[PDB]
């Protein structure tokens, strides 16, 4: 029943990102003293269905002069990576139990920029190419600090295994052990997904949008597992699943709140932010988190 | 560039060479070659112009290909024997690959094509460094694995280098290309004796380095890069031209000068191994190098070429910076033949 | 012969990008070849080294290559018999870099710092 | 001492991120050499048995080597439990 | 200003203390698990040796049956000059068995997730 | 065996492609990187097969140095383009033998 | 050429990584530890020429352990003969080699 | 060169210990405490001879010692042991720390019996 | 083989969904009617590459902490991080992080 | 009012409930009512292989207790 497990992982993610659009519109409306969609469906519950049907029934505007190869390749890679990032996640058991799960997520995340590069190159426009280049530069810049923060945090875990993070946070959350790294990790996840205040940029467009929102939910779930560890009882995993889902939802709503609250950066401003505030602090905290377990004789077990 | 950065880069070049020279692990030798190549590129490009950039990219491509094949030879040697120590090569295919990679690193024929262009593109100081210091590491590696070289391939490449240097030097009016072809011929002479005696290789390398340093410093002092520009030096400093003429006579292998010591010794060593035809051809071919050295001497000091009026102003000024060790280099490159038996110091 | 199949594909991708057509397409061919090679290493048992290929090589170096381009115009027998205990030997050997390979760390760090300096000096221009 | 204090006060304003970075880095460099628990961490690493303990052939000249695990001879881990 | 930094340092120290205690307990638990493995190891070694010897003997009997008519063959000849025992390779134990168990013994651990 | 042969064959193909030089110096850099990837795969397979634990650092080291070289090469390429407007190999003919 | 700075100073800059049988972490042995140890002990202090001439047995055994060419050749011969016999129709596999056996712990 | 000597299939016959990994893990500590002598003889022989064929008798001895240990456990402390190893068998990691309670019972029982 | 099947399923579903998206609206009848090369972006990419190499060096730290040579390992890890910080400082001071 | 956002969020929650729970149940269904055995480090892989050989039905999760020791 491995195919059933794979499908039961894939389909609910797609439905969740389908209804996250309605949740985002409703939350933004209510924070804007108005209402979100409440006409199509009893409370807007049919709105995602309507948008999906309209998008799938509308004419696709092929450039008629661009390279069809990369044009069709880019959304495939985007959605495939977005769906693949979910398989090692423990909630509380992963679909695929990996020794180096965290490194696997990092590698796929590094892959994710190829869709941006190829869609920009195949758009057959100089301005879209410039926008794609700017997006790629921002993404690689922030994934550097993502990697360093991730290794610093895992220094208290003992391995790259994602399930061990449940054992590490059995009594206390990792947020209490390292909140500054958590703050920079949250901001770097915001800048990785091109979310406000970093949003500086019909069918294929729907696929790209679906991949983006799946990446948002996946990043929030990874953050919840990494920093707010839920207690897991081996004889009732539903409790862990409920806690993990609630924390993921809270983090996603925080993303929407941040989008609704702030102006957006300039390009040079976010590049300066990273390279001159996050990188020095991240390096200093990486030194601190290397030295701390040795100083206090609190090295984690596995090797 | 900034003098601090320039000093750091030069020290990095020397440290890469020394890492090659002191390590017993193949990976560390490869790392030393990589460090040397990385630090060498800015030194060539120090004076920014399209010619220097072109020379730097040519040199980079050549050295990167050579280093890639060196890594391949190391991996094949490890595959056929779980060894990392630099010793006997344990495999003929790996040893052929290593020999070819080191030959392209040195610029031996038929991998000689990059040397004249790189030397012409870069300035005289970069050319001095490239033609003197950049030969130590590959030659040291070749000396360490001399007992495994196939003598046929080594001797073929050495004889080809001597012939190519002699023939290519005849056609040159640019002094840097003349130096490059001379370097190719001297590399051929150095590598023709590796299978029989590495002490002879080291002695030839020392004599060649002394002579090349002296000639490059003389060319820097009289800031000339062409034959006609060098033909004006007698009207400002005839002493420099006379010293350069004696140095050129030494570089041609004429006794009783210093440049006769290597060939003589090498010939003797080859004769001790029942090799007669090859040293004969080698001396016959070195006659060509001597011919174009003599042509330079004719145009430089033995005759007086026409001058220009604006030379008179140059009569009123003296060189502000004097290169130390230039007199010592001239003396060592001209008058050390009576001290030949000192080679037993295993120089 | 799963390993053999991967090897054949690896060579086919190399022939594809070695013809050097349209450097963007040569880069795509090299990306496919690198993926197949990482798969070979993973199927052999080198999980960390294969993931290192997949992360460093593919996501940094080929990404920078594509960025720069966009700016411009038989088996199973030779295997072991026993087990590795309660750890993975590849991870232990790789982690021995900080306890055994002090010299390697020193020379590599110096080379990387020199590389940063060299890149800045070369791209300065003037 | 006045110039250094003035520099620190001027850096704490208009540049707090760099001050925090240098402070944390320096503390991470300095503290491990002064802590007494680094020896405890080394000892804990030593006491983790990854390999099988191969027994030694008894010749009647090894009183420090126990003949059974429960024998009082050999290293103890009471200190680790008390930690 | 001061109070915010004090609160942050306080929560950092509390987390450090809690993690120190928990990690020391985890080290003790890992030592206990390793000791259980060490206690179980000799029986596993004996069983492994018996199984390897049985497989080698079965392969030897089958080789004797198959290579009877080959003129220059010698049954159970070594490829080494030394008489020291050599640990067999995977192809030596499963060379004559079915593909399913060959692929099991080769890729089961690698493919298990 | 066969697997080793394929890896070597890939290295030889990449070296031949580098030495072909149709145009587009970027293709030369890509050939160099393919050669290094082949070397990485081959060395990793050898080191893992023989259980040479301490040699497990060796692939990583190689990779790092190679990528550094790659960066260097890229910089050179860019400068050449900034002089000619293209990375064409035939434009590097100012210096001749 | 080679300047043995390590031997002069007793530094051990890179000698720890030169052979399989040299102090691996956690005492993890190489696959061919015994053959390499025997070959090294045979060839020690004798020189490359005499080592190549006189320690050929140990080096041959070490190479056989490393690449297993003779073993694969023998296995291939046995498998080919079995395939020919089963194609002809005189030999049949036992239940042990057909998956019908009784496994042991 | 030479013929590889292998023992006959009769030399490799012994009454196997037919319990799974959870049962072995549950009793691993007492098994190590009680069956130390044959196990250490076998391991010393194994590391000294470096030959599987030279250590068969000690292997049969360690199998016999394990069988005797498990027979004593069966005759004395059946049900608490069953609960303990069911505990251990449930977990995907077979952790000792989940149900120490059952362990205590088992320990108490053996301390009263053997 | 489980990861192979999972990747195959993900890629198959992505391809099928994108193909139906691109081909469903193509059955009905409708009308059916440079130079600059910024240096700064190249510098950002190269800095990313070098910093990623240093991250590749720093990656084995979670395993490096169980060696019994804790002082040497700590010294070498701090050396790597200090040289990484020095690279950042050199790029910062020579105006390599400007726009 | 604001609780009108609650329905859609609930739907999202339900979707995010499905994978994890499903995995657990499947793991319990294909591993004999127990947790799926995890095997890193290759020693517990040997334990699982030995369990498979001991069960007699080629299934590792079929546990053989003391009643099988005779
Ligand atoms: C035998 C084998 C030998 C093979 C060949 C020998 C290698 C020769 C090249 C070495 C350096 C190049 C050089 O000196 O110029 C050629 C030189 C001619 O001088 P020049 O042409 O007037 O100088 C032009 C410079 O390029 C103008 O550049 P600059 O003005 O920027 O110079 C800055 C200067 C001043 O450096 C400083 O500012 C010092 C500050 C310290 C920096 C701290 C950094 C630490 C991190 O530093 C140097 O000149 C480089 C010294 C490197 C240190 C080596 C140890 O000729 C020789 O040096 C012949 C050397 C004889 C052989 C070596 C000794 C005999 C054995
Ligand atoms: C033009 C003539 C050449 C001039 C050369 C430059 C002169 C200035 C150099 C100043 C002296 C440098 C010597 C360094 C001091 C100590 C050296 C010592 O530590 O090293 C010894 C080595 O000492 C040197 O080799 C001796 C150098 C003496 C050079 C003189 C020979 C010149 C040939 C004859 C021409 C006459 C020249 C006389 C006027 C200068 C041990 O060597 P070893 O590590 O165990 O083996 C490695 C070398 N192998 C591989 C070849 C065996
Ligand atoms: C002797 C001459 C000194 C002056 C000349 C220096 C020449 C250039 C500098 C390069 C020299 C490097 C010196 C260090 C050699 C490494 C070996 C030594 O340090 O021992 C190590 C000890 O480690 C030391 O702590 C290393 C500290 C050195 C690093 C700090 C500064 C490095 C700067 C070097 C220059 C690089 C650029 C300069 C940056 C400022 C090994 O530790 P140990 O555990 O016993 O053995 C490991 C094997 N085990 C596992 C079986 C036990
Ligand atoms: C795309 C993703 C590539 C990598 C996917 C698998 C990553 C991984 O680590 O899983 C390996 C997995 C689990 O190993 P461990 O985690 O170490 O634990 C098992 C021991 N207890 O085991 C395996 O090696 C099986 C997978 C190897 C074969 C397939 C590898 C992928 C091959 C892809 C080739 C096609 C690439 C095309 C180009 C790609 C460009 C984007
Ligand atoms: C003895 C023990 C020592 C312990 C060592 C640790 C001590 C800790 C000292 C304080 C560390 C705190 C650092 C936390 C992160 C600091 C980064 C930072 O300050 O960057 C800011 C900027 O950072 C930002 O403002 C980014 C915010 C972007 C808006 C996005 C919304 C963020 C607000 C919502 C709250 C997020 C909560 C995260 C929770 C995460 C939960 C997982 C600097 O920018 P400038 O003001 O322009 O000044 C520099 C230019 N000259
Ligand atoms: C010795 C420990 C070292 C290891 C820790 C290092 C961790 C990482 C930190 C290094 C990262 C790179 C740092 C690069 C430094 C660049 C400095 C610089 O040039 O910035 C100046 C500005 O900063 C400066 O003025 C220079 C440095 C100022 C001093 C910084 C702190 C110095 C030491 C203070 C802390 C000392 C110890 C703290 C103890 C407190 C008690 C615990 C220019 O900034 P602009 O972007 O141009 O903007 C200016 C226009 N608005």
Curated annotation (Swiss-Prot), chain A:
Disulphide connectivity of cysteines: none
Principal subcellular localisation of the protein: mitochondrion
Subcellular compartments: Mitochondrion inner membrane
Transmembrane segments: 2-22, 68-88, 100-120, 146-166, 171-191, 208-228, 238-258, 279-299
PROSITE patterns the record matches: COMPLEX1_ND1_1 (PS00667), COMPLEX1_ND1_2 (PS00668)
Pfam families: NADHdh
Catalytic activity, EC: 7.1.1.2
Gene Ontology CC terms, in alphabetical order: mitochondrial inner membrane; respiratory chain complex I
GO BP, sorted A to Z: aerobic respiration; mitochondrial electron transport, NADH to ubiquinone; mitochondrial respiratory chain complex I assembly
Family matches, as InterPro entries: NADH_UbQ_OxRdtase_su1/FPO, NADH_UbQ_OxRdtase_su1_CS
Record keyword Transmembrane helix present: yes
Catalytic activity: a ubiquinone + NADH + 5 H(+)(in) = a ubiquinol + NAD(+) + 4 H(+)(out)
Record's bilayer topology term: Multi-pass membrane protein
UniProt keyword terms in alphabetical order: Electron transport, Membrane, Mitochondrion, Mitochondrion inner membrane, NAD, Respiratory chain, Translocase, Transmembrane, Transmembrane helix, Transport, Ubiquinone
GO MF, one example: NADH dehydrogenase (ubiquinone) activity
HAMAP family assigned to the protein according to its UniProt record, in alphabetical order: NDH1_NuoH
Subunit structure: Core subunit of respiratory chain NADH dehydrogenase (Complex I) which is composed of 45 different subunits.
Cited function: Core subunit of the mitochondrial membrane respiratory chain NADH dehydrogenase (Complex I) which catalyzes electron transfer from NADH through the respiratory chain, using ubiquinone as an electron acceptor. Essential for the catalytic activity and assembly of complex I.
Similarity comment: Belongs to the complex I subunit 1 family.
Protein name: NADH-ubiquinone oxidoreductase chain 1
Biological source species: Sus scrofa
Lineage of source species: Eukaryota, Metazoa, Chordata, Craniata, Vertebrata
Swiss-Prot record, chain B:
MF annotations from Gene Ontology: NADH dehydrogenase (ubiquinone) activity
Annotated Gene Ontology cellular component terms: mitochondrial inner membrane; respiratory chain complex I
Pfam families membership: NADH_dehy_S2_C (PF06444), Proton_antipo_M (PF00361)
Keywords: Electron transport, Membrane, Mitochondrion, Mitochondrion inner membrane, NAD, Respiratory chain, Translocase, Transmembrane, Transmembrane helix, Transport, Ubiquinone
Domain of life from the UniProt record: Eukaryota
Major location category of this protein: mitochondrion
Recorded topology in the membrane: Multi-pass membrane protein
EC number: 7.1.1.2
Mitochondrion among keywords: yes
Catalysed transformations (reactions): a ubiquinone + NADH + 5 H(+)(in) = a ubiquinol + NAD(+) + 4 H(+)(out)
One BP term from GO: mitochondrial respiratory chain complex I assembly
InterPro entries: Complex_I_Subunit_2, NADH_DH_su2_C, NADH_UbQ_OxRdtase_chain2, ND/Mrp_TM
Compartment list: Mitochondrion inner membrane
Disulfide bonds: none
Transmembrane stretches, start-end: 3-23, 25-45, 59-79, 89-109, 149-169, 178-198, 200-220, 237-257, 274-294, 325-345
Family to which the UniProt record says this protein belongs: Belongs to the complex I subunit 2 family.
Function: Core subunit of the mitochondrial membrane respiratory chain NADH dehydrogenase (Complex I) which catalyzes electron transfer from NADH through the respiratory chain, using ubiquinone as an electron acceptor. Essential for the catalytic activity and assembly of complex I.
Description of how the protein assembles with itself and partners: Core subunit of respiratory chain NADH dehydrogenase (Complex I) which is composed of 45 different subunits. Interacts with TMEM242.
Protein name: NADH-ubiquinone oxidoreductase chain 2
Originating species: Sus scrofa (Pig)
Curated annotation (Swiss-Prot), chain C:
Keyword terms of this UniProt record: Electron transport, Membrane, Mitochondrion, Mitochondrion inner membrane, NAD, Respiratory chain, Translocase, Transmembrane, Transmembrane helix, Transport, Ubiquinone
EC number: 7.1.1.2
Membrane topology: Multi-pass membrane protein
GO cellular component labels: mitochondrial inner membrane; mitochondrion; respiratory chain complex I
Catalytic activity: a ubiquinone + NADH + 5 H(+)(in) = a ubiquinol + NAD(+) + 4 H(+)(out)
Protein location: Mitochondrion inner membrane
Main EC class the enzyme belongs to: translocase
GO biological process: mitochondrial electron transport, NADH to ubiquinone; mitochondrial respiratory chain complex I assembly
Primary site of residence: mitochondrion
Any Pfam family: Oxidored_q3
Listed InterPro entries: ComplexI_Subunit6 (IPR050269), NADH_UbQ/plastoQ_OxRdtase_su6 (IPR001457), Nuo/plastoQ_OxRdtase_6_NuoJ (IPR042106)
A GO molecular-function annotation: NADH dehydrogenase (ubiquinone) activity
Transmembrane segments: 1-18, 22-42, 44-64, 100-120
The family this protein is said to belong to: Belongs to the complex I subunit 6 family.
PANTHER family attached to this UniProt entry: NADH UBIQUINONE OXIDOREDUCTASE SUBUNIT ND6, NADH-UBIQUINONE OXIDOREDUCTASE CHAIN 6
Protein task: Core subunit of the mitochondrial membrane respiratory chain NADH dehydrogenase (Complex I) which catalyzes electron transfer from NADH through the respiratory chain, using ubiquinone as an electron acceptor. Essential for the catalytic activity and assembly of complex I.
Subunit structure: Core subunit of respiratory chain NADH dehydrogenase (Complex I) which is composed of 45 different subunits.
The protein, known as: NADH-ubiquinone oxidoreductase chain 6
Swiss-Prot record, chain F:
A GO term, aspect molecular function: NADH dehydrogenase (ubiquinone) activity
Substrates-to-products reaction catalysed: a ubiquinone + NADH + 5 H(+)(in) = a ubiquinol + NAD(+) + 4 H(+)(out)
Regions crossing the membrane: 1-20, 28-48, 60-80
Sorted UniProt keywords: Electron transport, Membrane, Mitochondrion, Mitochondrion inner membrane, NAD, Respiratory chain, Translocase, Transmembrane, Transmembrane helix, Transport, Ubiquinone
Chief subcellular location: mitochondrion
Gene Ontology biological process: ATP synthesis coupled electron transport
Subcellular location: Mitochondrion inner membrane
Topological type in the membrane: Multi-pass membrane protein
Enzyme Commission no: 7.1.1.2
Pfam families (UniProt xref): Oxidored_q2
Gene Ontology CC terms, in alphabetical order: mitochondrial inner membrane; respiratory chain complex I
InterPro entries hit by this protein: NADH_UbQ_OxRdtase_chain4L/K, NUOK/Mnh_C1-like
Family in the record: Belongs to the complex I subunit 4L family.
Annotated function: Core subunit of the mitochondrial membrane respiratory chain NADH dehydrogenase (Complex I) which catalyzes electron transfer from NADH through the respiratory chain, using ubiquinone as an electron acceptor. Part of the enzyme membrane arm which is embedded in the lipid bilayer and involved in proton translocation.
UniProt xrefs under PANTHER family: NADH-UBIQUINONE OXIDOREDUCTASE CHAIN 4L, NADH-UBIQUINONE OXIDOREDUCTASE SUBUNIT ND4L
Assembly, per entry: Core subunit of respiratory chain NADH dehydrogenase (Complex I) which is composed of 45 different subunits.
Name of this chain's protein: NADH-ubiquinone oxidoreductase chain 4L
Source organism per UniProt: Sus scrofa
Taxonomic classification: Eukaryota, Metazoa, Chordata, Craniata, Vertebrata
Gene symbol of the encoding locus: MT-ND4L
